[PDB]
Amino acid sequence: LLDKKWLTFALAIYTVFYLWVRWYEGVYGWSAGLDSFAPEFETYWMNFLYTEIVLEIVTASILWGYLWKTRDRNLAALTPREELRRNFTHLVWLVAYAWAIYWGASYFTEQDGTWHQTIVRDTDFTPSHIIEFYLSYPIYIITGFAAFIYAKTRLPFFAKGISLPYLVLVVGPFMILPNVGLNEWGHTFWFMEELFVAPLHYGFVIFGWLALAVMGTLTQTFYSFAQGGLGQSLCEAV
Amino acid sequence: LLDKKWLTFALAIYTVFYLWVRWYEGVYGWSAGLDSFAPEFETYWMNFLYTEIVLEIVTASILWGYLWKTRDRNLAALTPREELRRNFTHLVWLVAYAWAIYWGASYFTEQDGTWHQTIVRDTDFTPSHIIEFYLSYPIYIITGFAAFIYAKTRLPFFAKGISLPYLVLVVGPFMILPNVGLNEWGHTFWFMEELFVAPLHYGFVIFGWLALAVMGTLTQTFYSFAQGGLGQSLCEAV
Amino acid sequence: AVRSHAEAVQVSRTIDWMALFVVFFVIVGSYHIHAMLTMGDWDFWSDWKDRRLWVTVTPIVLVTFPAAVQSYLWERYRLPWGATVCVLGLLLGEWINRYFNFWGWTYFPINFVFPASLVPGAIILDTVLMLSGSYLFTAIVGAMGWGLIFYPGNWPIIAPLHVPVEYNGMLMSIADIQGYNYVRTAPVSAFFSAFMSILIYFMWHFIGRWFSNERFLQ
Amino acid sequence: MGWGLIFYPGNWPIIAPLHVPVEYNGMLMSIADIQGYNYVRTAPVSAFFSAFMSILIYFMWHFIGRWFSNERFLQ
Amino acid sequence: HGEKSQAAFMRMRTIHWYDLSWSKEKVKINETVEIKGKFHVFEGWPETVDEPDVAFLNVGMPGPVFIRKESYIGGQLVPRSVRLEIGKTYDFRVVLKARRPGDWHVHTMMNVQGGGPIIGPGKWITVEGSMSEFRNPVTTLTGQTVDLENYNEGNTYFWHAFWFAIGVAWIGYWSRRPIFIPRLLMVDAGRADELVSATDRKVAMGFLAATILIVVMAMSSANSKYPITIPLQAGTMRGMKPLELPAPTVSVKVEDATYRVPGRAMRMKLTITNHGNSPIRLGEFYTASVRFLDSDVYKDTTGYPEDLLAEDGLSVSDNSPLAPGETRTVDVTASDAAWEVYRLSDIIYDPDSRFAGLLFFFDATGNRQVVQIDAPLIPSFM
Amino acid sequence: ITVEGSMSEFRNPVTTLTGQTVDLENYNEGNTYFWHAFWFAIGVAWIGYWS
Amino acid sequence: SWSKEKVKINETVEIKGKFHVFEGWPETVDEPDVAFLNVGMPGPVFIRKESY
């Protein structure tokens, strides 16, 4: 009844997973992860890559696949009682997104930042690259989409047309593929050194600012709460 | 009756003041104003600065303070007979602004231009800087505001909402603080020399172009004349 | 308020003068700041009035205001002196400065620090827009003229400064000697500048639409 | 304006101890210098400038934020 | 004027000026004063200063209180910019004609390309007379002899007035009529186009044709008189002849060099070691235009500016003759108010606490050796 | 090259021209922390007050 | 020097000589840090087999 600790899943699922990761690199950062031309890299680190990409395509196909088919067809008439329960679960999806972004855009990002300072890169595939770009980012993008779709398929208001701020919020993440990938790409001609002030990194900054579309998304979410028959009891009682 | 030579004040008040200034530097440009590390600079020129800044904050507070409180409360019903007298005094304020801008943006500006050519600056506080930036500019900005406020508080039409061209016309001046101050600021890395073509000066050009909002302000002023019951006698008699 | 349609003529007249003063000095002020700020001082020195850079940048950087105030005084008053008012503002503003400061204040000859002559162009702009009242037309042949005319427009002032002198073993033009003495601290160029003025007149025609804007806020 | 100006004085209590002079092997260096030198990786006009600049940036971004507040739907 | 406020180490390690001389201290309008000397571009030129690939030999004065008649680096006249080469020493010679009565502090400065006027020592020179006396005559390759003070002045004026008048004439023509509030309203409700008509558009093209006409007439009229004309001569002179200096016979080594916080003096511990064959003594340390002398050893006669010459500013712990072959370590102190007055003491705000100077050594019969020193200079507060 | 021992053993002492001898490993650490916490708290205090 | 003035298709002609880069090189011309030894002709009326 109402909004459960199905939420506690959402918070701990990343926390545990990513804390296992931080341990995992923590021990193989040094050991295998230093010299990429050693065969212990092609097993502890490269295989890790292929594993995750595959797992991501799959879970993405399953996760989006699931929700799009369990899209509520008879949305036209379902109670305000559930138009709340659902609105709340949607908010859990957003907490999961925001948490997922934290890890990607703050944690593993500025971590890679430190890593560059301490070893000259042997590949575009350092440990922290395997984790920052090809694990961390796909995850928060998948979470992103999930939420979007949940809202579109589960709640009226959001079922009517496309939310521009919500589209920007989930597509910005996805556009950071080359944006953050041009980091090392762009910086190679004029200056190969990974200077974060270089124009090559400006795409990451622009796509990072698309996270501010969360403000427009939350405004629309709270308007979906008010349309669903809420915000009138205690609001008027105030 | 109608529009007085309270105007003659407006024209001569700057003229006298600034002609006294031009004399004043004229004699102390050479003598004290050459070597800033001499104690005759800290008296004839630095004290001049502190004096003016204080006088400006004060007169600005008094001048705007005055008019905002003597704002016509019962504006709703006052005659076209005075809706003209007032419209005219407003126009005097604009003549005072334009005159004040002349001195700031043309006179003392291109003067400082000559000064730079003839001595290498000892401070960001040369005589012509004390006068160009911290005397000349505050004055025309204060005049600017005055006019704006007069219009807002004294004339219907302008009392309804905010005139965008008039806001641009008086705020542009104020924004030129750093704009014209980046003149010497910006030009210090790539090239310290005060090259006016340098990107450091582009803010002064952009804020100088906001003076073109006078055309939108005058169009609105003449529309305020036509709304106040004017432009129908001789206009239709033509 | 308004008594007779004859006094009404008198107010509109005493307005005309007051407004003109505003319009004119507010131009002089802001237009001058613009010349200044977007310049490396070719206008200041007789020995920076060259065939490439002076001839190219000057008409281009200066079409701006004319273009903008043209888009207002003609559109809203059919007053076809938009360009030439601007130009006169800059010129007065500069002369007053060059005379009382460049000469009066610090002592540079006038034959050295005189400004560039600007009227011819502004007349072409003003008249071309007036006849065939199409802005697009002005932007193309009007700005064309403004650009082209500029150098020939200065040539009668400039030419005497370009007589050759063997100064201490080196060829120099008078103008050179001037800059050398008074101590501070090639018609493709024309075409370029005309071709460029077009995009600038154009861009600034629309910038001027905005400065004509009459909204209120909140 | 404030945001810009306050910044450096705002860091000064943290920073200052790092700027004590040391003669390190014959060369003047501040502690901070020695730190970067040791731990191996691989002037209030400045303030004013930064304040003056923040203004155009606050301003430009005030409107950028209008767009991210935008509430439309699509098709 | 304008040094002092500029970074103390820039001033120490950029250009060294020495053997400066000024032919006169007081001069009549139209008279000449000649500045001579030498300058060395310091080998350890600062990064923040573009190398002098394009530098210009200027004069440091309040405008044309003098006019520069001639300037020479090496043998060559230098009206253009010139490429100077790091490490090298050159001799210059500026020749000034007096124009404005007064007291001028004239400096010799370098226009050092990418960031910086590099200002040398300034000396006070007095001009007596009337500005109305000044002439600047020049004879062209065209026959005529003109006065640059006023040449082409009237012409300039005419053409500006003429065109200015025509600008007025145009606004004038339209402003016989009422300008704003009627013309504005006419445009508004109903069409404009009654506002401008025939008697108007004839004048429009009158002006338009008249203008193009007068421009072209004027131009090829200006081409008729003045048929011989050149373009502005410009472009950096390369191949500046540097001065051929004999290898110095003394070599010095700077071990630590310190200055006191609130102070007026810089100490340095030098190991002077005298190769070559005559007992040598130290007579001067030149640093940033400021010259510190041991007057037991050397005495300026050139009338070097009084605020920059520290008559016995320089004290050596042991300044006895240093025998040939002998080598000693000595403590040297350069001390004088000029150290605080010209703000070399402002090195404490600089991001690069390193100094640079010239030491001058003199043997028994009074011929001299110039060694250059540079080193880090470290503060001491406690 | 192989390092034997404990990181807890490491010292990086430096004597200033100001008298004091400090350990660069930890010099000014507590200060840094204080000022960041203090200001951080005040940021929280402000949102706290409204929340 | 030019080894021949008249030549048959598929035949060789060899150009030799010396060049001095002038010490007073003009400012408007980037120093020859990256220069290329080319041939001035109307296209491949000859092909450059070798250059030294």
Numbering used by the authors:
A (entry chain C), B (entry chain K): 45 to 282
C (entry chain J): 7 to 191, 213 to 245
D (entry chain B): 150 to 191, 213 to 245
E (entry chain I): 33 to 414
F (entry chain A): 157 to 207
G (entry chain E): 53 to 104
Question: What wording appears in the published article?
Answer:
To investigate pMMO in its native environment without the use of detergent, we conducted cryoET STA of pMMO embedded within isolated M. capsulatus (Bath) membranes. The cryoET STA structure of the pMMO trimer embedded in the ICM was determined to 4.8 Å resolution, and is consistent with the structure in native nanodiscs. The trimer architecture and folds of PmoA, PmoB, and PmoC resemble the previous crystal and cryoEM structures. Densities corresponding to regions of PmoA and PmoC not resolved crystallographically are apparent in the map, including part of PmoA (dashed pink ovals) and segments of two highly conserved PmoC helices facing the interior of the trimer (M219 to L254) (dashed cyan oval). These regions were fully modelled in the recent cryoEM structure of pMMO in native nanodiscs, which fits the cryoET STA map well. Several densities not accounted for by the pMMO model are also present and potentially correspond to lipids. Although the side chains are not resolved at 4.8 Å resolution, density corresponding to the backbone of the helices is present in our cryoET STA map from native ICMs. CryoET of these membrane vesicles reveals that the ring-like particles are organized into an ordered hexagonal array. Analysis of the four distinct trimer interfaces contained within the system over a 100-ns simulation showed several interactions between the PmoB soluble domains of adjacent pMMO trimers, including a strong salt bridge interaction between K60 and E338 as well as more transient interactions involving residues K58/E160 and R167/D339. There is a moderate degree of conservation for K60 and E338, while other pairs are less conserved. No direct protein interactions were observed within the transmembrane domains of PmoA, PmoB, or PmoC, suggesting that the inter-trimer contacts responsible for array formation are primarily mediated by the PmoB soluble domains.
